[PDB]
C-alpha cells in the first residue's frame, strides 16, 4: 500500500505515535516519507552485509525482524519480517516503537539524521487534522 500523506498522519496518530518517547508526528512522517515514500511493501537488499530493509520504515533484519537468511541476526521485535510488508501497519508501528526504546531514539535511522534532524518538518502534517 502507498499511503497518501494525511491518510498516514492520521493512521500513525491512531496507533499512538504522536509524541511516543518524545518523537513528534511530523518526525515519523518525515522518516516514512524519506525511507519508502509511504510504501508498505518497499524492500531493500544490502548485498554488503546480507541483511534487508522492510516496509514503510525500512526496518532491518539484522536486529529487528527475522527473515531466516541474515547471518547471526536477532529478532528484537519478535516478528517475521513478512509482518513488516502488510498493508496494515500496526506491527510495523509496534516494531518502530521497539526501535526507539533503545538509546539512540529516532536517530536509529540514518535517513532521519540526513533529511529530518534540525529541519523544518512542520510541512509533513500540515492540513492533516492531527
Ligand atoms: Na533478524
CATH number at residue 48: 1.10.530.10
Number of domains in the chain: 1
Q: What was the experiment behind these coordinates?
A: X-ray
Answer whether 50's CB lies under 8 Å from 69's CB. Answer: yes
Residue 30: which domain range?
A: 1-130
How far, in Å, from the CA of 49 to the mean position of ligand 1? 12
| Phi, then psi, of 19 in degrees rounded to 5 | 80, 10
Q: Read off the C-alpha cell for 81.
A: 519480517
| Residues in the chain whose C lies over 2.5 Å from the next residue's N (breaks after) | none
**For residue 29, how far is its CA from the centre of ligand 1 (angstroms)?**
25
12 CA distance to ligand 1 centroid (A)?
24
Cα–Cα distances (Å) from 82 to 54, 57, 98, in that order, read: 8, 13, 17
What residues act catalytically? 35, 53
Closest CA to 97 of 121, 129, 89: 89
Amino acid at each position: 500500500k502507498v499511503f497518501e500523506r494525511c491518510e498516514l498522519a492520521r493512521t500513525l496518530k491512531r496507533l499512538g505515535m504522536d509524541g511516543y518517547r518524545g518523537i513528534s508526528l511530523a518526525n515519523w512522517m518525515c522518516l516514512a516519507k524519506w525511507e519508502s515514500g509511504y510504501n508498505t511493501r518497499a524492500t531493500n537488499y544490502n548485498a554488503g552485509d546480507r541483511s534487508a530493509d522492510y516496509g514503510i520504515f525500512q526496518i532491518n533484519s539484522r536486529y529487528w525482524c527475522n527473515d531466516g537468511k541474515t547471518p547471526g541476526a536477532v529478532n528484537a521485535c519478535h516478528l517475521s519480517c513478512s509482518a513488516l510488508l502488510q498493508d496494515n501497519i500496526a506491527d510495523a508501528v509496534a516494531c518502530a516503537k521497539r526501535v526507539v526504546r533503545d538509546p539512540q531514539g529516532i536517530r536509529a535511522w540514518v535517513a532521519w539524521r540526513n533529511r529530518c534532524q534540525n529541519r523544518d518538518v512542520r510541512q509533513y502534517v500540515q492540513g492533516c487534522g492531527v
